[model samples]
Target: SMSVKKPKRDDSKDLALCSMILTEMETHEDAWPFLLPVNLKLVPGYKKVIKKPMDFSTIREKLSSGQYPNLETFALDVRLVFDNCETFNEDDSDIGRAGHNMRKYFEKKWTDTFK
Candidate 1:
């Protein structure tokens, strides 16, 4: 396919459908604002010594500064965030859901985006 059909301005599929792909599609050097906090919140905790993993803001900076070559690499970084978090999609916790959803999102988008 040459291109995916653009969404209508009034079409509200989900808060994520629009923004998620937009952010993922951009390179770190594209210039942006704020951190892209990883879904580490997928596993909430206070005594884990570490809060999970770095946020997207930090990751993107690395990309812009020559740390990552592309979003695909950044996506791998995001996976590390989930890997660092304890207990993935085996429960009804938010963190698990985050991990599950993100995995699903990535798999689907890969077929559509990387084809």
Candidate 2:
């Protein structure tokens, strides 16, 4: 067990970031207390608002075949993630509005797209 070997270095380049957040709102100052007073931004997409008609695009694509794949279980799975998102929350406890708003738009998109 006394043999010596030189180690090899790996050169993968996956971690490079193509963009940056670059700023913090002045009103958001009080929330961070323990760290230095420097600005630290979240990653670009964190809690991002998918927003209005744009939000339905993915669901519209998947459910376009009319059947929506499973008739029974996927509703809750899709719903919890879609509605439970902090970004989507409003006056409705993760909803304030989008909970029912999404249902209405989603159904409208669903019936029209699936045809």
Candidate 3:
């Protein structure tokens, strides 16, 4: 038994939870701005302002591929998407409003699921 490796913690439940969150975000009406990556051509200098941008599609892709080893990393990316939006868009802008709404919804969902 000295050479045996320890098994990794089970994450199937976490995966399901993460998947559900992404599904809800995708269905939300306010998810428009974050459905996909931002186009640099449309919003020049976007890459400059946001050091690390995150979007729903990318997060989903990573989740499906098992890139996130823990729930915290998955949650961090989700929050990053909204935080970036808040930083880039004006508070009164359409996208910014949606971002705020989406963040609120996710936080509630997260709390309900974990707590």
Candidate 4:
């Protein structure tokens, strides 16, 4: 088997796509919980459980600074937003459902844009 697609690195295009994804996430209704870092005051054990927290605000900063090498890395960071949410909240809980919803939305957009 041979690799046909070269998969050239295009920072500008990747940046634009990631920026758009971030905007959609920020505007989403379920975005509230993941928009900012989990407040330790609200959930004192958050740090203990989550290990590494992720949020839309931080993703934006990382994107703008060109920290992501490609869309996959960017997607990984975004996925963590929901991954942490599910880990911390019960599946039936409001925030947990929100995480599911946001993850669905993100995956769809990611495929629509790139796949």
- Models 1 onward score TM values of 0.46, 0.29, 0.89, 0.88
Question: Which candidate number maximizes lDDT?
Answer: 3
lDDT of each: 0.50, 0.33, 0.93, 0.89
- The alpha-carbon lDDT assigned to residue 15 of candidate 2 equals 15
Q: Give candidate 2's TM-score.
A: 0.29
Q: Give the TM-score comparing model 4 with the true structure, all chains together.
A: 0.88
C-alpha positional error of residue 114 in candidate 1 after TM-score superposition, expressed in Å: 1.8
Decide which is better by lDDT, 3 or 4: 3
Error of 4 at 24 (Å): 0.6
Query: Residue 110, candidate 4: how far off, in angstroms?
Result: 0.3
lDDT of 2 by residue, 1-115 (tens): 3587668443232111100100111112321221121122543443344332122233334344443434323344335434534343455553435345444544454455333
How well does model 1 score by local distance difference test? 0.50
Error of model 2, residue 115, in angstroms = 21
| lDDT of each residue in 12-115, candidate 3, tens digit only | 69999989989999999989999999997789889899999899999999999989989999999999999999899999999989999999999999999876
Which portions of model 2 show Cα errors greater than 4 Å? 1-54, 65-68, 85-88, 92-95, 101-115
What's the distance in Å from true for residue 104, model 2? 7.8
> Which prediction has more favorable lDDT, 1 or 3?
3
Instruction: Flag regions of model 3 displaced more than 4 Å.
Output: 1-11
Best model per TM-score: 3
- In the range 1-115, model 4's lDDT, one tens digit per residue, is 2767777655567678779989999999889988888887788789788888999999999989979988889999999999999888999988989999999999999999888
